[model samples]
Target chain A: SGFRKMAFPSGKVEGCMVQVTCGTTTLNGLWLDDVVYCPRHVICTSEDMLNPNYEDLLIRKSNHNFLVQAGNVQLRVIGHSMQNCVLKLKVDTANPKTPKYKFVRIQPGQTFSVLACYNGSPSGVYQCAMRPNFTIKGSFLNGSCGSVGFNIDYDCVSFCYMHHMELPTGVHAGTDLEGNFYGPFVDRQTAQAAGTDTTITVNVLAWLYAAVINGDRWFLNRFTTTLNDFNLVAMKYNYEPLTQDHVDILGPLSAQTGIAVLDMCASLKELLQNGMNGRTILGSALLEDEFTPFDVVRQCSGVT
Target chain B: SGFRKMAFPSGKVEGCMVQVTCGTTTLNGLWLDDVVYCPRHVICTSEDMLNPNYEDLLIRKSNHNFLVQAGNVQLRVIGHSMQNCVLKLKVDTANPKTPKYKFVRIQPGQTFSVLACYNGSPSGVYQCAMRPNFTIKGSFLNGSCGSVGFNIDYDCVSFCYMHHMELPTGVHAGTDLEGNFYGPFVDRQTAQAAGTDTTITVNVLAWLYAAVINGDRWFLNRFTTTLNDFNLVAMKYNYEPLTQDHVDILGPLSAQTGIAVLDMCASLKELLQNGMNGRTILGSALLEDEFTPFDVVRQCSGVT
Candidate 1:
């Protein structure tokens, strides 16, 4: 309902578009006063739309001749208007399916800016036009985009991976955080339709216990598979495989649950290194075989 | 035992003190041949003791005239010796009852460096002496030590506070992370002797539940008091009171525990903010009465 007057920092220019007729005509029910002061109207201009050093990359097809270029981490566009108008710019990047758009205000001889189409984008295209009535249109504009490079910084201190566990279709029984149950619901549809899939929704405490049970091939596979994937990720990044920091991060959870996550990772890696298969790793044949994964994770993580 | 010959990096000079003899009449059973082709006998000299800019803070009482000063984060000592000798320096800091000691090898005219008595040291005195024969002794030398001023740093993003929690007598039943118990023993002595004192060793998860229950004023007091103290620490350091990063650090624990430790802190602060009293706030009588501390922590921390 109201507008405030503003100005850019010294040495920095170009923000909004200017409007011609302030009192009589309206742009999207908004009006800008001329360069001189007026209470009923706002004053705006796009004199310094793009940064001073910015390289112009592309321009629009219409008389406006909106320009586009990479600006810092985003794309910037400058537009010219015949009169006061509401404008929008759409950025289409590597993923053409999902295009992002931005809106701007423009007056006669004013310009507007919009974000680049992609994150860490090296190159992209842009579309600009006046919104709603489509009074002004722009051709597909292409430009060189900026990108961030990767660097190796420090050694890996630990690793942890957590995910939802899938449950069998027939069995649908598990508790939630508060130890509330989802099963004995009379039927499967009733259980799922209520958003309480008892079998699939695993309770944290129960999952810990299941992981420790001897001869539990299913649970054993989960641990080994996850460990394998975690190790591969670490190796791919040329980082050391460790889990003490992450276990310390978990803090009381390991102490209270008696499941030292680090210890579990260490044991898993140790067994894999020793050429022992996951199915037999927890069997009675190994030394200290009586100890469970829960015991190892908690003990290694210094749960006590 | 075999020793490997090593060379210093360019612009890096002076390392360990060397012995003259290797096998028979062992120069402390060590030797370092000169870089240029030389006889079996090693030619080494302690030309550079402390960096040129380091100030001399202390000197030994004996004829050796070994000097000590704060060199970077450690203590550096320079000694004038006629022959190779076994030297040791002790640094006494804030906790004088437990002093730290270091052994150094001093080849005639060599300077030895030892770690500072303590990190984050303010001011401190050092004691220097040649152990065993005591060829060189250092008087209690005084010096202005460096201290680090505490500032809110990025590392504080993860908060971990671990300490013992006490409980009432006769209520010894509680499960640990592995679901082990410190429970109702036959008598106090039996429980105490067995390292299962009812008055001590709280189960972290069990405490979590007790804090949520109504009429548990004792548990509520403990939580509120600790939380208040934690908040004070955070405010004193001008740190952001949030836990998303810490929860990420904890990873799977926050994912599975159904309780976000950071979420716990946040919820506690929120409830404490909206409180007439603890009882009404905790009980199912207020607008958001149905939510427990656990639910809030989980919900805020993205426990699911």
Candidate 2:
């Protein structure tokens, strides 16, 4: 008998509330209660493993390894006609921006099972966008891992601002250790008597956070205006017309966490065509510029 | 020896990094070291306080109580031409939005040495806009505590979002107790396993903060657009004509924190003439209609 246990594609398996992030598509709840459910516009059925005919569905080329599991229990892949290739499972296939993977070398004719591990847990769903002698450029994981075309690393950079650092109660709203009641209603002297240095640090953090969120709005507005000004210039000069490339280059401007996007736009400005011939070339130049590696602004240390 | 100290007025105090939010005016820094500096266009010398001729400078109204500090250290007030009165110091002059005070009761005669005490600290800079059984309506504390005409209470409502909640470590970035990493990079399965129910709760708060900040921008835009739309209606209809009253009614709409302004506008709307004589009144009526106070959309919980 084949492995009877089933596997969840999106990596989350909490009770019946299964959340599957299949590529850009999201399917909220399909209970894995021993019943087979088709996802992704009904692309793949459960019986495809036993009968094995994914030629039109997923096999775009002759040499591609697909995620095939027995009863949805384990992380395993079946190699089609393609032999002596390495099968690698990218841990975060869902977010192709920040790629993390683990791989095993598969021999020409050896029975192989790929059990993926991350921090000693078999809980990661992998992507097959790997270098199998040549680039195996398609997703085989039930359309779950699509090419997250935009830079995932860029998203992860601002990811810190996405979630907050949970400060203990009473520490956030009150006075600092030196008797400074920060601002607004709290009294400086009384707060100083009541709080410690630790409390002050937390209070300062809380204060800075408020300032950032408020100012973040202003920064986003400034960035938007900056883009608008650029667009105005484009229209006046009659440049070939603004494309998605123009918008994508300044995408990070909206994040509001840092001023690095300002610098990046300046760099991109240097590469824009002075004449009309290279409108599209500017985008590729920016994409390559993005990968050229620049330091992201680090969080300030100790009120500096 | 009589009190040998002096009080710094709002305009001066240079070289030592002075910050003044002068009701409607702002002076960044004057940096007063040992030298006397008058910040608001005119510079001052230190010796001007004692011989005392700030009369031509400040005393605009008859019933106002002015700052009468002892040695420039303690909070004291003098009853101008009025007798048998009480003097109180509103502690938080830094922010007029929320009111807090420390007071002393005065009687008929007996040189009242009102040594005010708020936890043995001169840690507060008090506002001189005090009640003397009648409205002594004028600012007295270095011109800092000028009567903030609009409700300060309304300003305090969204004050918290104006600041931030601080997080301490890198661990806050990764997965929580249930091991779920609360960010853009983490996949569903891994995030679910790593993050806890409580983690999700906090995660939801973090998510809401971002959504609120973003939505705040939109709200500000809507209010601005709403005001602009009202202006167009006023021009087209030729009502009593758009006055500062109409502008003031919708003033708080841009505040990003309340619907109180909308309610106030509605109240003002009803007072306007409904007939052709009050076509301008109809603009305000339409302004009030804008305030039907529809729900501003609940935040999406969890990663959708």
Candidate 3:
């Protein structure tokens, strides 16, 4: 069978809806039940495994050593190709930019079945783009892993503007916590004060995802987006080096005695794991600059 | 007299305040009562009138056919030079990039008694970054245009998310008027329905201003900003030619509708004037991209 796309049910997303808006207009129910799949392939011995415009690609069901790259998905030998095919899955390490993978040897007859959605649950799957990469062990042991999937390391960089956020019950607007909020994660003391069970609603302002596929790393989201603005593009970067000019800018921005630096690849796991009583809150931390974070929301980070 | 900088009073900005925030923290009081001034002069035969790092310096106040550029400011005669200086300020149309000026014939003693700020009030001074440029005729009869000034053509690009705006009295959320709200200006019908006395309350998302002084047209604001985030960058764009892929992206984004094409320099005067009961609501219109809009918030627009 060729690679196919599928959306995880509402149970996975759990009523998380994406609403896009412009001016006074609202676009509700976006990014919901989104699909996970990649284009099928062709051309053996070819190191280029990424399809710019990923579509259902047709190829011969013949045996070949196909290289699957990250920013894209991995492939497995299926159908008649699985009858005698031995899949070899090798992971890429030297380059996290475009993680290249070797073909996975099909555990045929026992059914090489299992699918992983970045939003699915497996004791490791998470919606937070910055939590750290979930590894594939002797994994995917359900029914044959029939569908396709792509792993996007995304971090939702959010801004809690005085007039923009919905505070948890009893938590007033503007809490001075330079160390209280780290990355998308909040500090425990702060969360507890805001009411352990109350959801401190922070808007999903923009997303930073990997676009290291083509040399178009300088091409996508410039980091200006909203939960209701459906121009879903990720920045090659929006974060920059921590500098005095940056520190100077953040200094008088408001009553912000301090800022949790972001608009970078930096993450605070402790901030995430302890906030809001451990209830998972998907969001981003932005250290906004005047420029667009690009290919849309990226900067010159991890460039060796 | 040489060049000096001064801030507009709070009376001009009204009760408006700039607040910067990250997660739960808020930094208030910014971009308020800011100054407008440029650096002192040196070279004579130079075409570049822009001083990147504007500062106060001592000039002989002597005679010279100096060229003043827009993006910078026009200099009138002062000091001993005021007795013989011919202050000539020629506006640029062929190039709005860096507005160039011819030396003005000194109108001795009058003190060029006026100053223009992109954010002051006269018959035409508006805080809104949009709206066209305020022109200067054979003007400035007051105190001989005493101070220094620069004209920056700016446009505020804003987004109204579901929870981001504080709606006017009686106006419920989720308005779907495709042609109703335009640019920084809102529509009349929508304004009337929401009560003209009320402020629709949109946040100042980002500012798009000219950065043509430097050869770096690819810099300044990438457009990922908040009125409070305040890195204060701008882009060198006036909207680029539309691409098919961009259209493809917008195709499914709108209803049996059209995308108000932005991320470019497409302004709707009706979108600006016909809304908000003629009351100016300051904000920006972002055609959200995946990159940081750079020097922090810009893209390719109107390149000669």
Candidate 4:
């Protein structure tokens, strides 16, 4: 709470300096607690924010990072800071996320594979409603243990099914792009029998939005209510880093051909409500601009 | 007509192996007949085209750049191959052009200064019609002033610094704010070919809005103040791949992840709205000789 220990130095370029990553560039700027003031705009401060409360030592310096002064740039915080205070500031939320910015970076052809409670015995391939606790002997299934979850396509850009999705039979498992960790199996039988809770089912899509959004408090404060539902059912398998595919470059609104897909993460909820699956939801929205006419996707995997 | 005297080798990979900059990663392709095929999309071949005139010795080799037999990818040729046959293949025509691929690369903070025949030597800085052919003699124009020219900036991104602009009313001077030297070309032909075709005039306000609206194409479109209302004409950068300077501030756009599909507009948008707005620009950079911005849309109606 006493973070504002230093006076918000106005014109003087002295204070805690910081490194900010503005799209693909890195810049140095002034630091005061959570917000950073750079040469251009106030990094991490929201343009929508008005009063940050009555300032006691607020020195209306010309070069301060504080918005109270006449400075202009402010973006959502994406990557947080370290002891050294380096930053990856957000420019526009709608564009694609920065590539592979997690504590861990996932490669293109990899999957999130959670160590199953049993690491489930091997099954070459099976077509049943694969589950964490499904009882099909691992041997008959060719030693390739599989489970119920959506699959992301190469380019990490799609949800395979268009209109309807098959139960995904005859497929070999073990390809987890999300995460693979052993679980909290609540007595496999009773929990599996009593019925599956939406809780256990993964919401990898929402998890990503949730992950990226965490850095920006304003979004949470303002969009929390709107984003609550999405966080619950849409998030899955912990957090995935923002990949090149997940990040999209949004052109000016003037070039837009149709209704703008604002808040792609939120749109995930909209798509799901309309029968779209999670895996494809993020890809479709992120790469929406690539569709030949967009109608094909608008009617299928996108059906947006 | 005797271009193919060199037999279309069956299995050997020999011929004009052209270099290609696909998106960002450059690659080497093969040049046989009219087409030069790269690794990915057959660099430049029509997906709809079939039967490229039966081959007298149509060697059905396993690996050939030609789509004559069984090939998967094909795209239009964007940057035509040079004498050495280096090509910039078109993945999708709708994206941004490669950055400054023209013989010229317009560094930021410069402009095409066609030498006003009179070089209207003076003007405290015209707050007037600022014309090249107008009878505003080389005097009354304060040897220390300026006129009619749109200026670009440091990152080589937008139109010019906003607010009231100073006409070239000066002591016959030029160069970028950092001192790069602009031009006052002797004629329109030389200027236009140099990619300064659109700067015939400069409407500061219109240029501003045009930038606010569409920063992708050249600064002369229908919006910018130019010799033409520009109700017609179009443009894009030669390339917009991220640069070290750009990456310095924005982080690697395609590093941990891979390259992002960027045309110049989105990146320009990122720039125009940054410290780029309203800062007094103080210098002029003549369009680089041998280099010109990408312009003109010529059809392949028939190759000369």
Top candidate by lDDT:
4
Query: In candidate 4, what are the lDDT values of residues A201-230, reduced to their tens digit?
Result: 122332223223222112212222233444
lDDT of 2 by residue, B1-304 (tens): 0000011111110101222222233222111112111122111123432232333433342312232222223222222221111112222112211222112222111010011111111111111111111121111122221111110111121100000001121111111112222232221112312122111111111222222333312111232224344335434433223335434533333244353343332322332223222122211111111110111111111101
Q: Which parts of model 1 are misplaced by more than 4 Å?
A: A1-196, A201-304, B1-304
Better of 1 and 4 by TM-score: 4
Docking class of 4: incorrect
Top-TM-score candidate index: 4
lDDT, ranked from best to worst? 4, 1, 2, 3
Comparing 2 and 4 on TM-score, the stronger one: 4
State interface RMSD in Å for all models.
Answer: 31.8, 32.9, 29.4, 33.0
Candidate 4 chain A least-lDDT 10 residues: A1-10
User: Considering summed lDDT, which 10 consecutive residues are worst modelled in model 3 chain A?
Assistant: A1-10
Candidate 2: C-alpha lDDT: 0.21
- Assess candidate 3 and give its TM-score to the true structure: 0.17
Error of 2 at B243 (Å): 80
The reply for model 3, stretches above 4 Å from the true place, is A1-304, B1-255, B258-304
Query: Model 3: per-residue lDDT, tens digit, A33-129?
Result: 1211111212211222222111211233232233332223432322211111111122223222222222222110111111121211111111111
